[PDB]
């Protein structure tokens, strides 16, 4: 019972195995102050007494009160984490506690200021692991302490704090040698901001790294990276298949992948517009106006089939689409945008009001 548990703490402390002590302090097991204080070192004396207090507060359903006990645990662990001079047996113990505090912030929100007060100490756990300066180093769990701040600061939406946290990890020697669960969770988040910074190519290498190495057993984590890849893909022009969307049972993009393949887009957009202002999606997903414009150019080019095409016909093809007040200056403006961005070759002549497209390679493939 409690004495067998405490003898397990004694064996975990004396044999310095951090995986076993991380397993005993977690809630993954089935598994107050004087019994923990009569035998342990004074940071570990407060540590496991507050672990027992957190277990009793879970059993009381007092999730506000459990959070401050689970603050006393990690402050005592940080004081014990100071006490090991150039040694890192206690580094798997941190994954047992700093993963917990995030969700123990969330329940303390229910019964976000409390997410904030949880979010200011995990900064200091990053400070301690970033202070030490390879096989005995204390920096192996640094990137775990950036993937617990990133799962707080997108639930409050603060972005300006997290541009030395990217700079600390990205300028490091051991950044390509972390654990493979955390190095692919992180590579999503810095990819995700790279969608919102109009720097899509930086997000192209990362989330495709996040999609390809995601595990089979958790389909939801595959689905979320699929959701956030689908704006940055098909702006590049990846153009998914029906079988992918049927396999992940996510079929709302598919009609859009009809309308982006060749107004249809506005009707299919406003039919389910409440999904695309739910995950930060619609104002990203409107920017394929300029590639669906090239696909409508392909539809006019394949149906009229000569080199020089008059602009009145593309004006007619947009007057079918019928959104808001299209004229002849708007047509030639967005055609000039297509012709310098690189999607459409040729030149615009104003003397005859005809567009010449390229003869041997008409619209270059992306």
Q: Does 34 sit near another protein (CB under 8 A)?
A: no
- Judged by CB under 8 A, does residue 299 bind another protein? yes
In angstroms, rounded to a whole number, what is the distance separating the alpha carbons of residues 286 and 259? 12
Q: Which is nearer to another protein, 39 or 64 (CB)?
A: 64
Please tell me what DSSP assigns to residue 218: -
Nearest approach, Cβ of residue 334 and another protein (Å): 6
Q: Which of 3, 14, 59, 160 binds another protein (CB under 8 A)?
A: 160
Report whether 93 contacts 77 (CB < 8 A).
Answer: yes
Please identify, among the stretches 23-31, 36-44, 65-73, 289-297, the one whose residues bind another protein according to the rule CB under 8 A: 289-297
Question: Does residue 178 touch another protein according to CB under 8 A?
Answer: no
Q: Is 364 left (phi over 0), alpha (psi -120 to 50) or beta?
A: beta
In 3D space, the residue among 232, 223, 299 whose CA is nearest the CA of residue 259 turns out to be 299
Q: Least distance in Å: CB of 152 to another protein? A: 10
Check residue 173 for interaction with another protein (CB under 8 A): no
Binders of another protein among 318-347, rule CB under 8 A?
A: 320, 325, 329-330, 333-337, 339-340, 345-347
Under a CB-based contact definition with an 8 Å cutoff, are residues 201 and 220 in contact?
no
Residue 13 or 130 having the CB closest to another protein = 130
Site string for another protein, 97-136 (x = CB under 8 A): --x----------------x--xx--x--xx--xxxx---
29 is a contact residue toward another protein (CB under 8 A): no
Which residue stretch of 5-13, 40-48, 56-64, 243-251 sits at the interface with another protein (rule: CB under 8 A)?
243-251
Does 168 sit near another protein (CB under 8 A)?
Answer: yes
Q: How far, rounded to the nearest angstrom, does the alpha carbon of residue 210 sit from its chain's CA centroid?
A: 9
Q: Please tell me the distance from the alpha carbon of residue 366 to that of residue 363, in angstroms, as a whole number.
A: 9
306 sits in the region (left: phi over 0; alpha: psi -120 to 50; else beta) called beta
Q: Could you say which residues in the range 71-100 bind another protein, by CB under 8 A? A: 99
List the interface residues with another protein, window 302-321 (CB under 8 A): 302-307, 310, 312-313, 316-317, 320
Paired sense of beta strands 308-310 and 354-356, if any? antiparallel
Q: Which residues, listed in sequence order, are joined to residue 347 by a DSSP beta bridge?
A: 356
Give the shortest CB-130-to-another protein separation in angstroms. 6
171 binds another protein per the rule CB under 8 A: yes
Q: Taking the alpha carbons of 256, 258, 260, 263 in that order, is the dihedral positive or negative?
A: negative
CA–CA separation, 304 vs 1, rounded Å? Answer: 84
User: What minimum distance in Å lies between the beta carbon of 55 and another protein?
Assistant: 21
Binders of another protein among 205-224, rule CB under 8 A?
212-218, 220-221, 224
Buried b (16+ CB within 10 A) or exposed e, 58-80: beeeebebbbbbbbbbbbbbbbb
Q: Does 164 bind another protein (CB under 8 A)?
A: yes
Other residues' Cβ atoms within 10 Å of the Cβ of residue 164: 8
Considering the complex, state which of residue 174 and residue 181 has its C-beta at the smaller distance from another protein: 181
Task: Report the nearest approach of another protein to the CB of residue 89 (Å).
Answer: 17
Q: Is 15 in the site for another protein (CB under 8 A)?
A: no
- Number of residues engaging another protein in binding (CB under 8 A): 105
Q: Which residues contact 314 (CB under 8 A, 6 or more apart)?
A: 296, 297, 300, 331, 335, 355
Task: Return the number of other C-beta atoms located less than 10 Å from residue 89's C-beta.
Answer: 16
CB of 38 to another protein, least distance (A): 24
């Amino acid at each position: 019972t409690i004495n067998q548990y405490l003898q397990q703490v004694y064996e975990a402390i004396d044999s310095r195995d951090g995986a076993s002590c991380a397993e005993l302090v977690s809630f993954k097991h089935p598994h107050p102050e004087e019994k923990c204080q009569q035998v342990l070192e004074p940071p570990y004396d407060e540590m496991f007494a507050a672990h027992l207090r957190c277990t009793y507060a879970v059993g009381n359903h007092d999730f506000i009160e459990a959070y401050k006990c689970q603050t006393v645990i990690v402050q005592s662990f940080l004081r014990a984490f100071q006490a090991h001079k150039e040694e890192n047996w206690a580094l798997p113990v941190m994954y047992a506690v700093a993963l917990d505090l995030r969700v123990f912030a969330n329940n303390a929100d229910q019964q976000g200021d409390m997410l904030e007060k949880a979010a200011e100490l995990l900064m200091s756990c990053f400070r301690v692991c970033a202070s030490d300066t390879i096989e005995d180093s204390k920096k192996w769990g640094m990137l775990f302490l950036v993937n617990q701040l990133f799962k707080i600061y997108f639930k409050i939406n603060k972005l300006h704090l997290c541009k030395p946290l990217i700079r600390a990890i990205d300028s490091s020697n051991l950044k390509d040698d972390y654990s493979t669960a955390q190095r692919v969770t992180y590579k999503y988040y810095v990819g995700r901001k790279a969608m919102f910074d109009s720097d899509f190519k930086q997000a192209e290498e990362y989330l495709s790294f996040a999609f390809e190495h995601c595990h089979r057993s958790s389909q939801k984590n595959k689905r979320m990276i699929l959701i956030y890849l689908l704006p940055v893909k098909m702006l590049l022009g990846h153009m998914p298949t029906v079988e992918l969307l049927k396999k992940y049972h996510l079929m709302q993009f598919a009609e859009v992948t009809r309308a982006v393949s060749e107004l249809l887009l506005h009707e299919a957009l406003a039919k389910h517009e409440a999904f695309f202002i739910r995950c930060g999606i619609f104002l990203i997903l409107e920017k394929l106006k300029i590639i669906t414009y090239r696909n409508l150019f392909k539809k006019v080019y394949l149906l009229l089939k000569t080199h020089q095409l008059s602009l009145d016909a593309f004006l007619v093809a947009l007057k079918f689409m019928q959104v808001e007040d299209v004229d002849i200056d708007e047509v030639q403006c967005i055609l000039a945008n297509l012709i310098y961005m690189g999607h459409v070759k040729g030149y615009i002549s104003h003397q005859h009001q005809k567009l010449v497209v390229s003869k041997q390679n008409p619209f270059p493939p992306l």
